[PDB]
């Protein structure tokens, strides 16, 4: 019984930590997306203006 109680508590804590990590990774993902877009667009513009 104590094992199962501790298992439930551990699953709770793991789900919470996973939610936190998902939030952080979402922020990083959006940052990297914006960076990729800006880099590609600056590349295109510099190749359009280097003619």
């Amino acid at each position: 019984a104590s094992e199962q109680s501790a298992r439930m508590s551990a699953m709770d804590n793991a789900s919470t930590n996973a939610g936190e990590m998902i939030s952080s990774l979402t922020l990083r993902y959006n940052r990297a997306r914006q960076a990729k877009i800006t880099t590609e667009l600056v590349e295109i513009i510099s190749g359009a203006n280097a003619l």
Partner: protein
């Protein structure tokens, strides 16, 4: 002035004049083909040549085609005759009911109010909705975000806001569709004509008589090119500034989406050759959003409140468009289908909703206390629901069951009918003042009405009607 077209590159028309060039933002009318074409100046280039953005399509244009200069920017008509009508960016009607016989015309590019002609006293806007006036109080001269699509009761919320602000504040209203679907515009027009927001009565000769209505409409259709959809919100904003300045009224201004405004600005800048910013947006993004939104404020004569619908691309609140819009937003109003599935209408999420006016200085230190108490209660009930999903609702204390009861009672109390939904449902409309809502929430949180049942709160607009429904349901 009179000039000639020299070249045509999509929606970018370069025009040559012989003398007295037109200023920027002025309007030019093309002559020599149907589908009257209007060009807004944007840039001088030299050689007495200018560059212009077209409000309609450029197919069928010829070099050397003649152009006239109107001598002023796009001039929209204004008046009480624009009530109940629809108008495009160039002021023309697209409702097939005649021309707008207005005695006045205003430019769409107007300087914002100065620092002196501005009201320092903020004040709420008495809508008549309980959840709104309780947990996300609006303001005069404010700008309210409205995060929600369809299946939530947004058009009905809009019509209720319009009707209540017209009844109480006596102020008219305006709806701007910035690149909206045409069938959606038709649906909205028919819903207004059904709900009484528009009164299109036929006359004997065959004309129409748009009598006392409560909303003008300005539609920049999605089939329209970039340049219209960017200059539509300014049209509607001038139409509202007319009511604000002269009539001295407190009006509304609904905007179907500000992201399409931003899309159109970015497109226009790409056509004109401006180097894009971080994520493709224009380098004049915050500047254009400020040129628009700084006219939506209170003055000494009247006011313009605004309800902008916002679309966060890819759930990225850090994107420059919403990051620049939330700086201007004084409130927020999220909708959810997870509350409409419970039958609750309006489906306003009381937790996700926010406001800068909820602080205990504008509303006194009782509104704030009641709101924070209700938010605490709803968070506790959320946690208790997450628990009951696993451990069942048998392992709860009496205080937990009391909290659950109060939470469900206030969640169903906040729902109310609408005057406009009468034609759809038969249930009548219920205006609810804010002191009444505050007292009802105080009692429900004190635990006085814990002896009432659940479904007595779902339909009503006050403790009186709730107790009456309970008395009659006991039978």
């Amino acid at each position: 002035n009179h000039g000639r077209i020299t070249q045509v590159i999509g929606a970018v028309v370069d025009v040559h004049f012989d003398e007295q060039l037109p200023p920027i933002l002025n309007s030019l009318e093309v002559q020599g083909h149907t589908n009257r074409l209007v060009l807004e100046v944007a840039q001088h280039l030299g050689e007495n040549t200018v560059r212009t953005i077209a409000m309609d399509a450029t197919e069928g244009l010829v070099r050397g085609q003649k152009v006239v200069d109107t001598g002023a920017p796009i001039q929209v008509p204004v008046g009480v005759e624009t009530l109940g009508r629809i108008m495009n960016v160039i002021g023309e009607p697209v409702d097939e009911c005649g021309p707008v016989p207005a005695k006045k015309t205003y430019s769409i590019h107007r300087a914002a109010p100065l620092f002196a002609d501005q009201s320092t006293e903020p004040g709420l806007l008495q809508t008549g909705i309980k959840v709104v006036d309780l947990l996300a109080p609006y303001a005069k001269g404010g700008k309210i975000g409205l995060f929600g699509g369809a299946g939530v009761g947004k058009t009905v919320l809009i019509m209720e806001l319009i009707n209540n602000v017209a009844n109480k504040h006596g102020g008219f209203s305006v709806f701007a569709g910035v690149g909206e679907r045409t069938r959606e515009g038709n649906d909205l027009y028919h819903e207004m004509m059904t709900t009484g927001v528009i009164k299109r009565k036929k006359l004997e000769d065959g004309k129409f008589d748009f009598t006392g209505s409560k909303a003008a409409l300005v539609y920049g259709q999605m089939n329209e090119p970039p340049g219209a959809r960017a200059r539509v919100a300014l049209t509607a904003l001038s139409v509202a500034e007319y009511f604000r300045d002269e009539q001295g009224q407190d009006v509304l201004l609904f905007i179907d989406n500000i992201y399409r405004f931003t899309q159109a600005g970015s497109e226009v800048s790409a056509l004109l050759g401006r180097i894009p910013s971080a994520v493709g947006y224009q380098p004049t993004l915050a500047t254009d959003l400020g040129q628009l939104q700084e006219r939506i404020t209170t003055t000494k004569k009247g006011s313009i409140t605004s309800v902008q619908a916002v679309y966060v691309p890819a759930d990225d609140l850090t994107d420059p468009a919403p990051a620049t819009t939330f700086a201007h937003l004084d409130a927020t109003t999220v909708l959810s289908r997870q509350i409409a599935e419970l039958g609750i209408y309006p489906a306003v999420d009381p937790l996700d909703s926010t406001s800068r006016m909820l602080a205990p200085e504008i509303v006194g230190q009782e509104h704030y206390d009641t709101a924070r108490a209700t938010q605490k209660l709803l968070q506790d009930y959320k946690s208790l629901q997450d628990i009951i999903a696993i451990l069942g609702m048998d392992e709860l204390s009496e205080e937990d069951k009391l909290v659950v009861s109060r939470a469900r009672k206030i969640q169903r109390f906040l729902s109310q009918p609408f005057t406009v939904a009468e034609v759809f449902t038969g249930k009548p409309g219920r205006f609810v003042e804010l002191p009444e809502t505050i007292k009802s929430a105080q009692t429900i949180l004190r635990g006085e009405c814990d002896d009432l049942p659940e479904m007595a709160f779902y339909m009503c607009g006050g403790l009186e009607e709730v107790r009456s429904k309970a008395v009659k349901m006991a039978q």
